[PDB]
Write a protein that binds this ligand. Structure first.
Ligand SMILES: Nc1nc2c(ncn2[C@@H]2O[C@H](COP(=O)(O)OP(=O)(O)OP(=O)(O)O)[C@@H](O)[C@H]2O)c(=O)[nH]1
Ligand SMILES: Nc1nc2c(ncn2[C@@H]2O[C@H](COP(=O)(O)OP(=O)(O)OP(=O)(O)O)[C@@H](O)[C@H]2O)c(=O)[nH]1
Ligand SMILES: Nc1nc2c(ncn2[C@@H]2O[C@H](COP(=O)(O)OP(=O)(O)OP(=O)(O)O)[C@@H](O)[C@H]2O)c(=O)[nH]1
Lengths: 438, 427, 74, 49, 427
């Protein structure tokens, strides 16, 4: 039927898996014990959880995700946390040595003897599932552990399972802020290894997420938790099509087919319009008009891209809540009549609407809004190549003076793979204006 | 699990490690007798990173004391934490060193290296998988440089895959007590640069000035200085034992601090230091910590990098912080002095935050620095060495010990090479 | 006295830690000295309040009765 | 009623194992308490001799 | 049931047996008066292996004390447990020893064998079914050599179907005190090899070294050394007296330890040896026991088997342990030194687990080994015998009692044969 398996690689990708699963357990009312109250929803594990959890005949919801990490610290608290009894002990795949921000160390030195266990994990999950539309891979380009380790597995899951989808979510490195200078090393290695195997890659940046917090959420001092709920709400919305129904229902296969125009480039942008503080929604009103203006406003996107600097190709809006097509198609018709929005003449239509009648709901102890009308904005534009244009001039200098090379060549690697990436990005960027040029 | 075995070398390290080890056991809350008072779950968990557990709730420190003179060791053993130190870990020689590097490197070391290697390996199988080792000693110390240079050589071939941390103190630039000290340091650093992967550089004169600046106590003890450096050395060790989102491994750190192999010398940096009245005239805020964190006076290592420029900077923050207040301040300091970094590398800052504050103070941090301020250091000793070697003062001893002028020739030639390489890359 | 040699150069602690704790109406009393950045993820107990007022799950029992067996064929 | 019965006996079986586990850790430290006491008396009998 | 009767001979074995015996009583908890203070059922249950019971709760030892000099026996009788031994069991002759092998072997033993053989057959009729005999004596001891060699020949024909255990000590290689001792040894070891089936080899020089090593108390008493060797013999006997799935019979062990008939000479091996602070500085774990168990410094019997290789190794473990840790520790040593055994036999280890910990400690073990380290022993005496047989020193005495050089020729010729035999099968 309609189910998938999520993947959370690296200490970077662990807390988001917690927060989302914590988020996911709320709307289903999942008690921390692991069972419902006296009311009847259990059975052969077939109900709203069956797409996400496995509440088998034993009666305990088993999340359909595997947490892989190499540094036992962070996994040790979470297995001593609150929902640890809900987590399968060794789906929390832990490791004993870090990748030390080294992409090759995380791909070669240690990934060999653990993937077979992980391959053993996925096959046990593969047999119990029925439809398994695809996978939800959560990672990071600047992965101290996520980068190297995920690269091997995504190769191996591709060769044995090449007929299903693989959905990729990753935090994109900050454009001008760099917490590491080996980050340009691994991130460029991740892209060239994934573009020929990754199905759909979705990226985001934290600084813009922070900007929203003190722009409209009015929080000058947020935390991870606020950020994790926001992206957790984002993945919750895209999975709401699976959990709920709507006027029409759309699946990731429809997204992939309609979003990516041509091979290689599969990197759209995500946005959530009704991001607002509690008091603003209190004495103001939300309707399809302003939220659509908000969702297309150049500063409400979480990626440092200027839309008027580029041109639009893909437009996907996922309406989760009480909306009606009457004002919807009228409002978007005005958006088509809008002159600033510059779609490519290649696509007369590029608009993918997904209606869901369930309103997004507040989380206990949360900071989000009180949403009756919401949109999950998936869009792709030519204004993105400058990020890699930012990456390459960052990379070419540091490669020219061959920084840190004694480290990487010390562990048995060479420059030929690094040379491969520079023309690959050159190939990637030149496609971007080629599809840009009409 | 991954752990560390520590080495107490040189007679200063006797003061260093003694203060250092109590600075650890105390804040895990073990009594001097050794019976741990179970109070903190996390320190009960991550005590195994440095200690093994004996019977009676007593965690044995996994360190080794080496010396030649019994009296220093007897004082340490008679200290409040001698009972937490082990007789088998007390290894020593039957000789007075004469504060001679060569005697401690060729004559006296010959019959002691065997036993210490037997001792250190016995703890090696006792543990499972080390990150490496750290060595508290001095580059200006006679027996320590004599012993340390020998050991760092031998430990390299046995375990060439671990972390060989070195903790050494630089003598007073003005006035060095030992007159043959420039000879000792020059010999030692020759092997040090070839053997070490990291080097902590600390100087006493700056420590005295810090007392004139913030301590203002006029008459402290040398142990108080040990207390300071142990606190700094404790801060860098907080990462490994403490949880919280910061990457602790020195190898997560070493690749981030070391651009090229020849870069081993690094300078410390510490967080709030406060005088009498300012203790209640200070509003602890991340900026004012950061302002105080980056102060030319709160420098304590060698000298002012104001003379040169900054290569790489890395600060670890200990307490209840968040990603933002460290984020904008890095942008603030980035824009405050953008030119005084090197255009070779942008974003040369690597930050880590420990959510577990020290026992009593909340808002704290530590800084490790690699700037272009070491040229003054070894150029200083360059005129010294050349001056004494110009007329080979204090030499008949070492020739009687069996040494020759040739060994020094490449040793200074190696040092002069480090002078150029630091100069070429920055200037 | 849980002091090394109190008034030491770096800051020190003297008060009894076992009384430094605060609680919330939806949580237990916790040690303020040792509050970590990760324990917030499940710290609070839930109320029946922050729950949606509607539930429209997908019921598939009638499906699986005919999923478990092949469809009719001539 | 198959499921409710199999599930209820489980935490009962769970309840049974930590109670013998806590019984295991309490008895070992008493001997640990005993041995240090024997290490206490041996020191003091070395004192008079 | 199967029991054991002890033999106490030689002026040394006069000392050891009492120390051995008082340990066993202290192990079993009998007061010096003899009225067992019943506290452990199992030690109550299996005291019958060595003791008979008199009237009123008095366990009489089934041991035989034999000597010539009264003052030793009077000191023994006035000892803490002389009241536990019988005047019936106090047999002696009417002559001084003079530390001559043949006087006790040809002259004095002739009128004393009749008495002891009557005594030992009386106690033989007292007991129902025997494993065999054990003899505590010395090979370098004049009275023990003469009587022991006589009795072992006599006991063979009367009961050739039992265990002829022998416990002898090798005199100090550096100095034998007794200058005629190499004659005494060569004569005895000649007679021993044909008549014996087991021989314990112990040398005192290692014991002094161990005292400097772990005892560390500088000045011990020889009785303390007896307390050391008795523990070795106690542990090998804990197998028989105590329950647990350990296969205890010496025959169960003998066929396991003895590949071929002439292999009688064996080395003991004992478990945790601990110094003043290490009693509460020791993490008593099966890995560290095996480490100290397989330490060349823990060697106490003759010398380091490092010079040779290992034929048969067998260690009995005493305490609350499990099969798996001893199994993995067993496989570690195979991987540790695979080349230092013989390719003749792999898996040369025999293991037995006594679940009953001793009184005073829990984790303990005993080791019995047959390694190729005895060549140095008799080859040492070979140069001794040849040089003294070269000019027949001190010979007019032995010609006086009725001996000839011809007996010496074959005794060393037999000795030379065993020199080669140990050589060929390993080298
Ligand atoms: N995805 C994710 N990213 C985070 C989180 N916290 C900080 N980040 C950012 O994401 C990056 C984390 O990547 P890494 O440091 O390589 O983590 P890792 O690959 O699992 O290996 P380690 O260095 O040992 O932690 C950092 O550079 C941060 O800027 C988080 O909780 N999740
Ligand atoms: N322990 C100790 N060392 C000090 C102190 N002040 C300065 N030092 C220096 O620390 C140095 C390092 O000690 P060691 O390496 O053990 O010196 P050594 O090999 O024994 O020979 P010397 O350097 O001549 O003392 C010494 O050379 C001293 O000059 C102090 O107050 N205590
Ligand atoms: N009792 C005892 N014997 C020792 C000691 N040290 C070495 N020995 C030797 O143990 C040997 C065995 O004693 P016996 O067999 O009774 O000696 P013996 O037949 O009376 O003749 P001698 O060997 O000359 O004394 C002696 O020869 C001593 O050389 C010791 O400390 N105590």
């Amino acid at each position: 039927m309609r189910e998938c398996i999520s993947i959370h690689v690296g200490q970077a990708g662990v807390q988001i898996g917690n927060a989302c699963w914590e988020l996911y357990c709320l709307e289903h009312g999942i008690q921390p014990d692991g069972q419902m109250p006296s009311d009847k929803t259990i059975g052969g594990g077939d109900d709203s959880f069956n797409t996400f959890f496995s509440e088998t005949g034993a009666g305990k919801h088993v999340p359909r995700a595997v947490f892989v990490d190499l540094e036992p610290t962070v996994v040790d608290e979470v297995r001593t946390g609150t929902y640890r009894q809900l987590f399968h002990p060794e789906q929390l795949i832990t490791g004993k040595e870090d990748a030390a921000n080294n992409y090759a160390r995380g791909h070669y030195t240690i990934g060999k003897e653990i993937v077979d266990l992980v391959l053993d994990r996925i096959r046990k999950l593969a047999d119990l599932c029925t439809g398994l539309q695809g996978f939800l891979i959560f990672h990071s380009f600047g992965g101290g552990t996520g980068s190297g380790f995920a690269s091997l597995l995504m190769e191996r899951l591709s060769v044995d399972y090449g007929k299903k989808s693989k959905l990729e979510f990753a935090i994109y490195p900050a454009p001008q802020v760099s917490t590491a200078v080996v980050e340009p090393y691994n991130s460029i290695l991740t892209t060239h290894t994934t573009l020929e195997h990754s199905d759909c890659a979705f990226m985001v940046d934290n600084e813009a997420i922070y900007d929203i917090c003190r722009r409209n959420l009015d929080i000058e001092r947020p935390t991870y938790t606020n950020l994790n709920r926001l992206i957790g709400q984002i993945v919750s919305s895209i999975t709401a099509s699976l959990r709920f129904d709507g006027a029409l229902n759309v699946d990731l296969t429809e997204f992939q087919t309609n979003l990516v125009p041509y091979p290689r480039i599969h990197f759209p942008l995500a946005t959530y319009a009704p991001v607002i503080s509690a008091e603003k929604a209190y004495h103001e009103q939300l309707s399809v008009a302003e939220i659509t203006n908000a969702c297309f406003e150049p500063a409400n996107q979480m990626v440092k891209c200027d839309p008027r600097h580029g041109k639009y190709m893909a437009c996907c809006m996922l309406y989760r809540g009480d909306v009606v097509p009457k004002d919807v198609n009228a409002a978007i018709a005005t958006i088509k009549t809008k002159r600033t929005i510059q779609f490519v003449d290649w696509c007369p239509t590029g608009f993918k609407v997904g209606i869901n009648y369930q309103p997004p709901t507040v989380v206990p102890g949360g900071d989000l809004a009180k949403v009756q009308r919401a949109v999950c904005m998936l869009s792709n534009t030519t204004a993105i190549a400058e990020a890699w244009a930012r990456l390459d001039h960052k990379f070419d200098l540091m490669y020219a003076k061959r920084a840190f090379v004694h480290w990487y060549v010390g562990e048995g690697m060479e420059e030929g793979e690094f040379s491969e990436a520079r023309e690959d990005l050159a190939a990637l960027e030149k496609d971007y204006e080629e599809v840009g040029v009409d | 699990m991954r752990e560390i075995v520590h080495l107490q070398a040189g007679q200063c390290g006797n003061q260093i490690g003694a203060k250092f080890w109590e600075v650890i056991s105390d804040e895990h809350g073990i009594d001097p007798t050794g019976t741990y008072h179970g109070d903190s779950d996390l320190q009960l968990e991550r005590i195994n990173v440095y200690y093994n557990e004996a019977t009676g709730g007593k965690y044995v420190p996994r360190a080794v004391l080496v010396d030649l003179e019994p009296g220093t060791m007897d004082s340490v053993r008679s200290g409040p934490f001698g009972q937490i130190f082990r007789p088998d870990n007390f290894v020593f020689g039957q000789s007075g060193a004469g504060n001679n590097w060569a005697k401690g490197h060729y004559t006296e070391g010959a019959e002691l290296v065997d036993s210490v290697l037997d001792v250190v390996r016995k703890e090696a199988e006792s543990c499972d998988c080390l990150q490496g080792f750290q060595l508290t000693h001095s580059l200006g110390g006679g027996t320590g440089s004599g012993m340390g240079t020998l050991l760092i050589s031998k430990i390299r071939e046995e375990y060439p895959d671990r972390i060989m941390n070195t903790f050494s103190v630089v003598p007073s630039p003005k006035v060095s007590d030992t007159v043959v000290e420039p000879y000792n340091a020059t010999l030692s650093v020759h092997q040090l640069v070839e053997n070490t992967d990291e080097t902590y550089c600390i100087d006493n004169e700056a420590l005295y000035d810090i007392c004139f600046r913030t301590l203002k106590l006029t008459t402290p003890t040398y142990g108080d200085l040990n207390h300071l450096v142990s606190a700094t050395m404790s801060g860098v060790t907080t990462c490994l034992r403490f949880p919280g989102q910061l990457n602790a491994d020195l190898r997560k750190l070493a690749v981030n601090m070391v651009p090229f192999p020849r870069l081993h010398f690094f300078m410390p940096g510490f967080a709030p230091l406060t005088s009498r009245g300012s203790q209640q005239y200070r509003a602890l805020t991340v900026p004012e910590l950061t302002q105080q964190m980056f102060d030319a006076k709160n420098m304590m290592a060698a000298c002012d990098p104001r003379h040169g420029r900054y290569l790489t900077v890395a600060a670890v923050f200990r307490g209840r912080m968040s990603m933002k207040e460290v984020d904008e301040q890095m942008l603030n300091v980035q824009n405050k002095n953008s030119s005084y970094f090197v255009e070779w590398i942008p974003n040369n800052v690597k930050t880590a935050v420990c959510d577990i504050p020290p026992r009593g103070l909340k808002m704290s941090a530590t800084f490790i620095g690699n700037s272009t301020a070491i040229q003054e250091l070894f150029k200083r000793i360059s005129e010294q060495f050349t001056a004494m070697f110009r007329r080979k003062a204090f030499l008949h001893w070492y020739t009687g010990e069996g040494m020759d002028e040739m060994e020094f020739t490449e040793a200074e030639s190696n040092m002069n090479d480090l002078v150029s390489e630091y100069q070429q890359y920055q200037d | 006295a849980l002091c090394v040699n109190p008034g030491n150069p770096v800051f020190s602690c003297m008060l009894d830690p076992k009384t430094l704790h605060t609680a919330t109406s939806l949580s237990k009393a916790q040690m303020i000295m040792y509050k970590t950045s990760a324990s917030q993820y499940g710290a609070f107990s839930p109320r029946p309040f922050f729950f949606p007022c509607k539930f429209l799950p997908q019921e598939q029992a009638f499906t699986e009765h005919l999923k478990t067996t092949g469809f009719y064929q001539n | 009623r198959r499921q409710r019965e199999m599930k209820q006996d489980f935490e009962d079986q769970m309840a049974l194992k930590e109670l013998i586990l806590q019984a295991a850790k309490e008895e070992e430290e008493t001997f640990k308490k005993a041995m240090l006491a024997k290490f206490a008396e041996d020191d003091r009998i070395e004192l008079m001799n």
